[PDB]
């Protein structure tokens, strides 16, 4: 959604790691920044961390030039030549279960309790 925004410390439905949905608490709301790239084989990923731009320091100094060449270090630990494209942040939802189990969700996937599931 919405329409209804989510706060934190609200009771909220969403899905457990086991991947089934229950009550959790959403304890804190947190900003994630992704970075866009194309890599030199021109496929393109949307959802690179700042630290996964091993060419320079982008936690500390902030994202790339526009256009600037870079590399990254890919999700089978492999390094790729890329080139920058934007960066975005999502504001997502740290939520906890029952259990103490915690996630960072977006909120699509975030769930009041009046509302019908899926």
């Known amino acids: 959604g919405h329409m209804q925004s989510i706060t934190a410390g609200q009771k909220v439905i969403s899905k457990h790691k086991n991947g089934r949905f229950y009550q959790c608490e959403v304890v804190r ?4 920044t992704f970075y866009e790239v194309n890599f030199d084989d021109g496929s393109f990923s949307d ?5 996964d731009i091993v060419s320079q320091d982008c936690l500390q100094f902030g ?3 526009e256009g600037e060449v870079v ?5 089978d630990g492999q390094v790729y030549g ?7 942040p999502i504001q997502m939802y740290q939520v906890e279960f029952e259990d103490g189990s915690q996630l960072v ?14």
């Open 47 to 51: 959802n690179l961390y700042p630290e």
């Open 63 to 65: 994202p790339p030039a």
């Open 105 to 118: 969700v977006k909120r699509d996937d975030v769930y009041t309790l009046d509302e019908e599931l899926p």
């Open 29 to 32: 709301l947190t900003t994630e």
């Open 82 to 88: 890329a080139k920058f494209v934007a960066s975005h």
């Open 71 to 75: 590399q990254v270090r890919w999700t």
